Design an enzyme around this catalytic site. Structure first.
Site, PDB file in Angstrom:
ATOM      1  CB  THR D 153      -0.958   0.037   1.202  1.00 40.24           C
ATOM      2  OG1 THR D 153      -1.885  -1.055   1.110  1.00 40.24           O
ATOM      3  CG2 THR D 153      -1.753   1.353   1.239  1.00 40.24           C
ATOM      4  CE  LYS D 155      -1.809   3.916   3.969  1.00 39.93           C
ATOM      5  NZ  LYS D 155      -3.234   4.076   3.556  1.00 39.93           N
ATOM      6  CE  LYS D 181      -5.042  -1.035  -1.490  1.00 43.50           C
ATOM      7  NZ  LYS D 181      -5.565   0.360  -1.458  1.00 43.50           N
ATOM      8  CG  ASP D 183      -6.049   4.997  -1.630  1.00 51.73           C
ATOM      9  OD1 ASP D 183      -5.988   4.148  -0.713  1.00 51.73           O
ATOM     10  OD2 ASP D 183      -6.801   5.999  -1.597  1.00 51.73           O
ATOM     11  CD  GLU D 184      -9.755   2.829  -0.785  1.00 54.88           C
ATOM     12  OE1 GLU D 184      -8.575   2.475  -1.001  1.00 54.88           O
ATOM     13  OE2 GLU D 184     -10.218   2.978   0.362  1.00 54.88           O
ATOM     14  CG  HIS D 274     -10.867  -1.400  -3.055  1.00 52.83           C
ATOM     15  ND1 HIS D 274     -11.834  -1.014  -2.155  1.00 52.83           N
ATOM     16  CD2 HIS D 274      -9.676  -1.143  -2.464  1.00 52.83           C
ATOM     17  CE1 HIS D 274     -11.256  -0.532  -1.072  1.00 52.83           C
ATOM     18  NE2 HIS D 274      -9.946  -0.597  -1.234  1.00 52.83           N
ATOM     19  NE  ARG D 275     -14.140  -6.039   2.116  1.00 55.74           N
ATOM     20  CZ  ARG D 275     -14.335  -6.880   3.127  1.00 55.74           C
ATOM     21  NH1 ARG D 275     -15.275  -7.825   3.067  1.00 55.74           N
ATOM     22  NH2 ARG D 275     -13.575  -6.774   4.212  1.00 55.74           N
ATOM     23  CE  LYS D 314     -13.297  -8.042  11.096  1.00 52.87           C
ATOM     24  NZ  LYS D 314     -14.778  -8.161  10.961  1.00 52.87           N
ATOM     25  CB  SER D 359      -5.953  -5.217   3.103  1.00 52.73           C
ATOM     26  OG  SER D 359      -7.355  -5.203   2.860  1.00 52.73           O
TER      27      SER D 359
END
Lengths: 203, 196, 445, 452, 445, 136
Positions: D153, D155, D181, D183-184, D274-275, D314, D359
């Site tokens: 990613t 940055k 990536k 970025d979206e 990408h979601r 989680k 991610s």
């Protein structure tokens, strides 16, 4: 505000000016209210908006919610083991409208449970504090505390549910393949066991 | 020549950015091109230029009497801000640096100050009631620009600046005059000797 | 008819604002003249018709909101006019000009008239691409940071074969300059045809960029009789994988240039703008359009370079006016400053900036001044006046790169170019014999 | 109107089946509520007209065939509804959504409503291209076998020049990662324009690949305001011989994605999905659509990668749910398991599987768990939480690659990554100075096992 | 990390502003939650890197500038966030959504989150086409002025042959309605294929428009699996010289819909927007996106009609919220009014307005209310609930045109529809036997 | 979701200062938050509104809406009022319960130590079918 059109326009400007909490943002709308207000009663309402001597703070109102259901207060006969006699002794609760109050004079224990449709449906509910090993073992989890709610006005037998029974002067939960002669004091409607660095997005 | 120490230190982000600027300039003068420096160490040619000229500006800060608060701060941040002062002379930089550091100036605001200082330095005989302190130069700009506006509300951004920046008391008055709107000396009807 | 003079009116953030320098006829009151300019630019002479009784279209009226007499001057005033956003076609300088400068210059009631500045509102600006690439992006594409870029003028202007032009280009690129220029006159002609010149210039570039390790480019002139042909030539430059082309935007015009600018972003080619036939419109102080406007218009109908002329032979007064529109071309926010000739605060809404091109009779000795005045974001075009270098084009180029590197190095150290400017070059000339022959050929200043 | 509740009806192998979590208003019987969703998602709430002579249109009637009350819940049930094959346009998720989740979520008689699952039948699935390429096909295009793939990613998220972005990408690839990536949110913008970004990113991939001798690729973001533009950017990626692109499918929409996925098979470019804006629809347990369905949808309107978030912070309820839809994205046959949230058996009819993308806040110490949980078929996307590597991006890459090779190597020996996972990286850090600086920058974790 | 909560900050005229209804977890302070929402929408969790020392990119940070707790409610507040203009791609709702609603809904630190409103600044709005045609232009094209337009829903929803669909359409158009609707579900399918339906519907339209002397149209559903196919179907409607098509913008999505809207302006076809699968996102008051935003988004990614639902069966509170976004769709300036749910003043910059479509179980008796509440600029869709007319579609149509003409006539005289509404229809039913059978079939209100 | 809370009810206003002070602090018995009590009492179960859960000692009082300023047009009705007895520091933006010469009342004064703040008003609450038609 009268039903003169000038008042109606001043009312709009009034209503819209009240949401703005800073006096500079309120200037377009006051200037309009003054230009348009026909009665003197209205023109004051507009003029009030010019101050920024502190006002009557809007009190902390919460809404009667008809969207969600309300809680029910339930009486607690104590921790099992218990006598048939102690469950018989807790009276039927009368919820006093309009706020569903409950008044009682003797000694009693209480719990607030959520408004679950079953619990609201119950004509007479009562709470008993027991352990999970009073019923069949459901999954691998170890025996823990359980809160049990029973409806005393549901005493008709069936093969798919549990019941509180007068076990010769003692309370007990069991189920029945065949309809019994043993006294049933109620029907079990609810069992319930007791009830962080993540500002991380679920990307 | 271990000059790989410079590269190793540059790659590993050892030390401050002024070190980096000096390191890179040493490497540059020692027969490296900027792509070579980028392959070996994470510094882009555009970033190499920022820190080489930034460190040169930083040399002028310490060699011309910047305060120790300024040199301490610009040791480890504000290369971007110091790059905007590259236009100013070896001497001019030290005061400008102090001013930019005092006012918590971002690179965009630094460019504006550097212009005002550079504008001022071309005057042979200085404007009356303004010294050649950078703060005065900025207050002079704001003064000059505030005089064309004839309504007091339009003059508010520019006065507020003049006050924030004015260093001498002679200047701060000139700024303060602009607050009135007792009528002034009317500008007399001058016509121009026309050589056209 | 004095419905167009409303001095009470406060202009909106979405309005287009014009500043005309009105010179009315003797006996014509300023209030009328101003209201005429707003009515003839915005709506026209208003033709009352039976339709006016039913519905009113007064929101589309342009209007004079301020009237400021010019001090020092003969019966002269600045009419400040405000037109609403809905009048104009999105992204069309062609329309802006058609509405604002369309008819109003043809009165009898005015002796003269000149458009000095336009305030383009942010919400109108955001409808333009602007430059195909910025100052920033151009430096990224070329890998050239921290200094002015250097260009070359090929000589003679006209008459050279395509292959000759390309050989002349090779040297001047080989000797250390970043660009070379197709002369503004040079579009396809009997002595030299546009494809042959594009091919041989591309040969030259390749070889010169190979031998030197620096990205080179040539401003190939795609200016042309038709849009078809303009784009045909753009496309061949693109096929030769060229970095930059050029276009005489005034002669070709704004509809044509806006096409090319967007084509330039689409294909990632840089766009060098020449301003031929500006002096027809922007010289006379009483009547015309100030270059200031034409520069704003070129920023909106796109460009990556623009010729801004020079400020070496011009006095302190014009110098400040020149450096005002240079700031309008290159900066994002430009504060209103009427001493520099800027009549409105121009906020560009993060539109990319154009690099200013300096040209004239400049030679090595002018370098310190040019670096001082303009700064890094500029292009310096040598070989423009009566000036040759007697060894060739490549030695001539070396002389000006060495000179520019010297001044840029000097400036970054903290040296004063204003006072040591001449010293910096003589010092540089000690080790560079190409600069030494150059220094002796032109008198310093 | 209770002609839509038929529990005696057995569903067909060609039926599209839905699993709605119905939460009726108190007082509303389950039977009516079940039959409301059947009628208001399948055909009209029947409007009886004079044409009952011509109109025996019972064939197109979607219907509830099972009603199953959710245990542990407040007056809630699963309506199992079956729609016939002919209702839907072939190869159209857009129609599938329009038909099923179209208007039924806007009742008043229900408090809330969530679509948990859809059984897409084989015969319907055969009308979709699905992923432009498989998991296997992707690994053959790239020459990368036997391990998770590693992504990076860039940055900061926003504000970088095109050239900056490219220099940033060059390193992160050069330092040992497979992908980088875009970025979206990074589609063309005033601070950075798309053609410039694409160009300089290409300069980087070319170089980094040449130097390393591994196929490198960057997820170039073709997400765009119009199909015209989206395809224009796909085409420029393709023109720059680019291995892979990316696309924000939900925001852009299924019509526009299915176009892109097909274009991606036609030009043989990989598609990284990408979601963004999933959490708007798929978070509240009482109302919306489970990501499970949006994952299944993306497998049909095509994609080669899809973000599945992370399963690390989680609990084991939610892990089972996350590894239920990672099973739906990657496997060919997925058996009905309701504990995991899989309401139907799903046979994919040899449709290519999508690689799950992890991610989150993940860093070098997460490696052993990630390799254990997901497996080889996954893409591990680093640089995403409050984490930097203080030497640069290439060093930060090297750390992760060395870390990943270590665990994959270790697991293949027979080492248990569950217990010895942290030792494996410690061992690794001894020889790699880049992993050493990384290991000490983040606190490690060991083992807090599960139970069910 | 509380660099994103700056309540001192005054938002600019160019900023995009969002109003989220934040419901944080117990123990989470409001100041943090707000600053998290700005950091996750705008920039992300900020990843500090060695690059931060050299240059700072903080101008692109979104930020909470105000924090206002919701009265009446459980630990709830409105976070007012401000993002600069440079974050967003011109003309892309797709991007706007991706940035603003992209990740921020997926916290654990919030229980819930809902986007209530977006302030689109004028300078961003001017980068969108907006509706292919306006309210005004649509009335000009159709020659229908001074009243609501009337549409028909074909029944049954599904299962009809293309030729049947077209015959059903013919009658309902022939009997006095202006439009007919392709059911949202209806794209090409085994029972009925998209070209056959387009051809026979166009037959029907022609004949019905010939016999009646009124321009008729049908919303042909070009919604489709791919952009290729969507446009293929658009093109056949254009080839059949059709006035209007439709598109389920949420299911198909915004990239696809923006393509179609511009195609719609290019070819002069009207665009009827259906909002299928809105209730998934905009029902729950604690979490999602209010339809208000989705309606603004459809105004920017173009539409000429939009389904707004109905306000006949809904209480005074929702009625005011419904009529707030109806005003955001149709008016040019909408004043901030928080009682109606409008969190910002939306200035549309002369972008055309969308007509609001009312639908539900409405029948002749609802007419007075609909004309009263919505006004003339609307479309009334009958045949939506459990309601038939026992004589056919054309008698059913006659009943609702006669009814609408009656209420519109009545309103223009000065009659009060609020109180004489029911009287107006019974009076109308005396001479129209089609309305008489209708009046007796549904109870009045 | 939230925990509902049982809260003690001192009676219908009008009421005396001691009556409120005679109500003991409630000890919720874990794990099920029971409340055992011996004397005469009235109770209500409210929702777990975060402010209430926060309240260290809450108490309920049954009064009419006209005891506070008139907010909107609506007629004076019954209101249930919750007060936290452990919030007795003054401020100008809220209502308190005070010491009115042998009893209390609800008042909006900004500088008042003379009258004791017995508690702070945290909650006011007033007392608490034919359509399958769709929002299209």
């Amino acid at each position: 505000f009268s039903n003169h059109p000038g008042d109606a326009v001043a009312y709009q400007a009034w209503k819209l000016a009240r949401q703005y909490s800073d006096l500079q943002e309120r200037s377009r709308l006051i200037a309009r209210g003054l230009r348009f207000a026909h009665s003197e009663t209205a023109r004051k309402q507009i003029e009030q908006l010019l101050v920024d001597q502190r006002p009557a703070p809007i009190p902390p109102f919460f809404r009667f919610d008809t969207e969600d259901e309300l809680p029910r207060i339930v009486p607690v006969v104590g921790q099992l083991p218990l006598k048939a006699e102690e469950l018989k002794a807790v009276p039927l609760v009368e919820e006093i409208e309009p706020f569903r109050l409950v008044k009682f004079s003797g000694e009693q224990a209480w719990v607030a449970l959520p408004g679950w449709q079953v619990l609201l449906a119950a004509e007479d509910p009562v709470t008993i504090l027991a352990t999970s090993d009073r019923f069949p073992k459901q999954n691998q989890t170890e025996p823990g505390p359980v809160l049990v709610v029973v409806d005393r006005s549901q005493r008709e037998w069936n093969d798919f549910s549990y019941f509180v029974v007068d076990h010769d002067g003692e309370l007990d939960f069991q189920w029945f393949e065949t309809k019994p002669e043993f006294p049933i004091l109620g029907k079990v409607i609810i069992l319930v066991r007791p009830r962080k660095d993540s500002w991380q997005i679920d990307e | 020549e271990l000059a790989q120490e410079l590269l190793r230190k540059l790659r590993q982000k050892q030390g401050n950015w002024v070190e980096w600027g000096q390191a890179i300039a040493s490497l540059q003068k020692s027969g490296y091109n900027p792509q070579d420096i980028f392959e070996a160490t994470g510094f882009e040619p555009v970033q190499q230029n920022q820190v080489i000229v930034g460190s040169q500006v930083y040399n002028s800060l310490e060699k011309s009497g910047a305060s120790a608060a300024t040199l301490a701060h610009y040791a480890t941040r504000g290369s971007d801000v110091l790059y905007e002062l590259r236009l100013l002379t070896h001497e001019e930089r030290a005061a400008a640096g102090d001013l930019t550091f005092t006012h918590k100036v971002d690179a965009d605001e630094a460019r504006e100050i550097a212009k005002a200082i550079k504008d001022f330095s071309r005057f042979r005989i200085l404007p009356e009631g303004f010294s050649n302190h950078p703060g005065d130069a900025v207050a002079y700009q704001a003064w000059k620009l505030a005089r064309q506006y004839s309504d007091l509300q339009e003059r508010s951004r520019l006065i507020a600046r003049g006050l924030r920046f004015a260093h001498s008391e002679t200047a701060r008055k000139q700024i303060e005059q602009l607050l009135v709107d007792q009528r002034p000396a009317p500008i007399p009807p001058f016509f121009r000797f026309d050589t056209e | 008819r004095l419905t167009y003079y409303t001095p009470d009116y406060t202009p909106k953030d979405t309005d287009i604002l014009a500043a005309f320098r009105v010179t009315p006829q003797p006996g014509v009151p300023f209030e009328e003249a101003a209201a005429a300019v707003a009515a003839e630019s915005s709506t026209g002479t208003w033709t009352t018709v039976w339709t006016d009784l039913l519905t009113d279209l007064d929101r589309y009226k342009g209007r004079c909101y301020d009237i400021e007499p010019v001090p020092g001057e003969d019966n002269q005033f600045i009419a400040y006019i405000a037109y609403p956003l809905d009048l104009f076609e999105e992204g069309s300088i062609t329309n802006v000009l058609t509405s604002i400068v369309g008819n109003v210059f043809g009165f009898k009631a005015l002796r003269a008239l000149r458009l000095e500045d336009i305030r383009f509102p942010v919400a109108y600006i955001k409808t333009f691409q602007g430059p195909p690439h910025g100052i920033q992006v151009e430096r990224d594409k070329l890998n050239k940071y921290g200094r002015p870029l250097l260009g070359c003028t090929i000589k003679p202007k006209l008459g050279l074969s395509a292959k000759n032009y390309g050989r002349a280009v090779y040297e001047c690129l080989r000797g250390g300059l970043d660009f070379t220029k197709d002369d503004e006159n040079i579009n396809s002609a009997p002595f030299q045809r546009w494809r042959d010149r594009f091919l041989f210039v591309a040969d030259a570039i390749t070889k010169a960029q190979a031998e030197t390790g620096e990205i080179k480019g040539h401003y190939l002139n795609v200016t042309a009789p038709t849009c078809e042909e303009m784009l045909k030539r753009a496309e061949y430059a693109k096929e030769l994988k060229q970095p930059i082309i050029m276009h005489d935007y005034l002669t070709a015009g704004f509809t044509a240039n806006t096409t090319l600018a967007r084509w330039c972003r689409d294909n990632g080619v840089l766009l060098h703008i020449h301003r031929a036939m500006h002096a027809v419109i922007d010289r006379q102080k009483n009547h015309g359009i100030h270059f200031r406007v034409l520069a704003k218009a070129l920023r909106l109908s796109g460009g990556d370079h623009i010729h801004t002329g020079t400020v070496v032979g011009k006095l302190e007064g014009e110098r400040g006016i020149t450096m005002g529109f240079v700031d309008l071309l290159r900066e994002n926010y430009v504060e209103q400053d009427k001493s520099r000739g800027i009549y409105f605060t121009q906020d560009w809404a993060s539109l990319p900036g154009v690099m200013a091109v300096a040209s004239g009779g400049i030679h090595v000795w002018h370098m310190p001044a040019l670096v001082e005045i303009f700064g890094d974001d500029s292009v310096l075009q040598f070989g423009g006046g009566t000036l040759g270098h007697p060894w060739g084009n490549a030695p001539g180029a070396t002389a000006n790169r060495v000179a520019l590197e010297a001044c840029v190095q000097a400036r970054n150290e903290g040296r004063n170019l204003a006072r040591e400017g001449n010293d910096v070059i003589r010092e540089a000339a000690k080790w560079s014999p190409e600069l030494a022959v150059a220094c002796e050929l032109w008198k310093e200043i």
